[PDB]
Ligand binder design. Structure first.
Ligand SMILES: [Fe+3]
Ligand SMILES: [Fe+3]
Ligand SMILES: [Fe+3]
Ligand SMILES: [Fe+3]
Lengths: 310, 310, 310, 310
């Protein structure tokens, strides 16, 4: 079934010290998160660029990463129920807070952790190029040759388009209908690996290090987290539901050229342009498309979604 | 009286080509804006850093600017009525659109242009060090020695703290009361040059290049703006009023040390810490404090605010 | 009272030999000029740049001086009566001519020496930063706190805007009225140090090395001025009064940023733009604004103007 | 009213790692200290040199800092009652101990934290150069033109003379009388910014990491303070009151030349030399004068002392 998604957003220094530190701390955070039986996996991204749409963001490129002093991270965790994420943070607050503060000397902004429901998902199981023989054999044996997925390679071997959209009050149904029809049209595009539409439903206070005044002071005063703030918040996640309605349109692509020309169908393929025009007519903000590299992931989140495995 | 504020937010390449281009285009945009009789001046900023609050954002510094591949700009325009800003953009769309696109090859994100009401302002006239004799003489002649302002030097010779806050629904009155009391306490801090509290009331669609589908395509297709999009929007500014309520707490300081230790009173001076704790107990997001350099400005916005001049 | 002004204009090589030579000869010319009891002081300038007004003169900058192979000098002398200047040149012709020819191997153009009446002056006494205590004390003791001037620092520690204007026949009264109202509006601008409006009334033949044919040959033939031309002219200064009417709008500023944003009020502050539009509607030429550095000066010309001293 | 003073004394490596670490840890220690309502502010110093008094310490200079492998820090905290300091250390022992040990790899000697009563204080509010207009205006409006203080700039923009004195038993009253008369004479010296006389009344055991045997072992054995020693001491602060009586004569100066020639009045101005000779006749040790730079400070301690603010 469809999980719920938490996206931990942080901006960190683009330094070898930061790469090394996150490679040591990130796995520990995933191990703590996996103490909760509602956790069904994760997908961690580094922003590598921006889709320029001709010259609209002419200072940007799809691969800018080398040039940048900081990195935006978008760390997705997947949950059977969105309250499972909030419960996991409360139950594991001390260990999580301490791991979060190991990243302290590297952080510029965040963490900020919006929570999402999935409106639509066409997200296949990941497979390595070594695995396609197994996937083809098992799909043929089940009489499902017609629904064999593309090869969506894990661990940094494909790219993500992270499309930010904010929708005028009352046009949410129109946005969802025509964003789904757009993602269905992308199934024709070479190197399309799937997509999903995320609808923001709140912001995690503990995931965002947002406490009451006493907690805020304890966060600032702690010697590397040894001194644990009391995790008392002034809100619960649904009380920070941004309006107007935020969506992320998340698509996955073999590489940045497939992304550019595949997403480009909304501009250059008249029949797809007509569908996506209905999406554009709902927006107060966007589209703004970040290019992400999905580096570290727990691909079993898609086994939960699709209710099968290889 | 209190003007309304539009803050044009953009992220641009940190290049000599971008510095030169903005120094040529920026003044022209100000001249077009000044065609509207509701325009009362402007204050343009470049973000130079982040207040780290000890190690909370330990990868940031108050002066990071040299290290960065891109710059955030926050370009304030001041208006007798917020609708004057919307009318100016509509009446001058072609010339503004074309100037905005000269910056095209330098832009990474934006423009995004929220509109604000001023809740509170203690913002003196700017003066050069050469002017303090005039300011002192005129104040003494009026028997107003008690209200002589500090010397708030224009054109890059002071710094700004840009404090982002998002307030839980129903706690806006509490936030405003205690944010005002905090800014009043800052009058005791060495190098405090004034502050104001901005309350977000909408987002300018034309200022944010947010049009209907037809307009969006014309923006992407134009050869440097010669081809002018039809400025038809799917919303007006009040239909993009973010909830929960956004505020900017804008303070001005002689230098970054005065900023750090002056703002720091909310953490290290017990009587001020007790005031600001009431602000902290209202927040769903923040505080997050950007350090800005106010470079190009039309200081006469403060003549409008304070209803006098030297 | 208002003196009359002679502005000796020359273009010289931008060389260390030229800087050294002018530093030795300039003071001697001032000492010769001071033989005449009508001489009330001087203010010598080097042009350092041009106000570009956005991209209108996009090859220019306010500080270009380093990049230039030649320098324009504008050497102001101040006189109780304009005929005093002409009498001084006639009475001191040999010594002045010989000092002028010491600069010979450095001159590219000039000298050209227009004469001016002052239409309007708001030009304070100069003071060093060490003097402001005296200036404040003396003004307070006189009950004149309201009219304390800004600190207008002498000897290269401020900048000058030299605004060239040529006015259509019959629109001189309109030009003068609204140029005065513009300079009055500049009193509100940070770092404004005063201004004056100069109206060209003739050209000095002896100051311009303009003699009859016999004199011209003696100028060309002289061995460094030992051989003195007979100072016979074919005109007197009022017979070279340019039409249409030339004006210089001379303003003084703390620094080039204060100059750019202060003069900029005629473009970006709607109420001042409306005043200065009446000036623009009188022009056949201009505005063209040179940026000058007032290096060597006899500040006592302002003691004569203002009829007081510290 | 007069606060009491704790001076935390440590010697640390003069390394970029030590500068960075103290810039991150110091603010956190101040925030923990500010949990106690008796805390009224702080003034942290780095020793930059020694007053050589001709050739008496001829190997020393007033600015030696660049040449040195280690730095002496003198971190002043100010308290309504000296017991407030002892209570703050006891109540916040775990968080303070952990922050103190983050500095561990940089420490050579200390911490050693004597406690003081203020015998005499002439210590103005600090002001930035931007603030002097406000300070002058508010003092004139209060009828206190006669008592306007000098501009004592915060955050590393002045220097401190830290004068060590030890007084023969029975000569304390003579020392205090003539040390006060000496500091009154310094009001005549250019660049004098105030002074105070501190009389040592004890040593903080917790501030000095002086515990019983069990605590000492736990201090040595702790993994970076995670393992918290039991804060059991063998003495209270008044049981480590050094005899004979220690004083610090603390004076503040615009710069090191004003310090040298201003303090020098006790040697070179006969009438002041006669006053200070009465101080010299009381000493068993001293004077020994360290030159300090007051870098990070909570200037509101002077608002408590003087019972007003700007
Ligand atoms: Fe989370
Ligand atoms: Fe705008
Ligand atoms: Fe002349
Ligand atoms: Fe202590």
């Amino acid at each position: 079934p469809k999980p719920y998604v938490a996206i931990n957003m942080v901006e960190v220094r683009n330094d070898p010290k930061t790469l090394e530190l996150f490679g040591k701390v990130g796995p520990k955070v995933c191990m703590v998160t996996a103490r909760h039986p509602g956790f069904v996996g994760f997908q961690n991204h580094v922003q590598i660029g921006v889709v320029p749409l001709g010259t609209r963001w002419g200072g940007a490129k799809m691969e800018m990463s080398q040039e940048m002093h900081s990195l935006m991270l978008m760390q997705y965790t997947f949950w059977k129920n969105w309250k499972d994420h909030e419960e996991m943070h409360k139950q594991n607050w001390a260990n999580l807070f301490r791991l979060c503060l190991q990243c302290a000397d590297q952080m510029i902004w965040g963490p900020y952790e919006p929570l999402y429901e999935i409106v639509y998902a066409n997200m296949p199981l990941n497979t390595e190029m070594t695995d396609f023989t197994v996937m083809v054999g098992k799909k043929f044996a089940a009489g499902e040759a017609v629904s064999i997925p593309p090869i969506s390679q894990p661990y940094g071997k494909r790219v993500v388009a992270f499309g930010e959209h904010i929708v005028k009050e009352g046009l949410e149904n129109q946005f969802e209908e025509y964003a789904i029809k757009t993602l269905e049209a992308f199934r024709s595009a070479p190197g399309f690996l799937g997509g999903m539409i995320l609808k923001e439903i709140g912001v995690s206070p503990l995931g965002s290090l947002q406490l009451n005044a006493k907690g805020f002071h304890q966060i600032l005063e702690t010697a590397n987290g040894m001194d644990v703030p009391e995790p008392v918040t002034i809100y619960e996640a649904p009380e920070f539901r941004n309006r107007p309605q935020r969506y992320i349109v998340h698509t996955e692509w073999s590489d940045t050229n497939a992304l550019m020309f595949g997403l480009g169908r909304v501009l250059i393929y008249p029949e797809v342009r007509q569908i996506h025009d209905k999406v554009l007519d709902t927006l107060v903000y966007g589209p703004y498309i970040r290019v992400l590299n999905p580096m570290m992931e727990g691909t079993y989140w898609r086994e939960y979604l699709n209710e099968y495995h290889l």
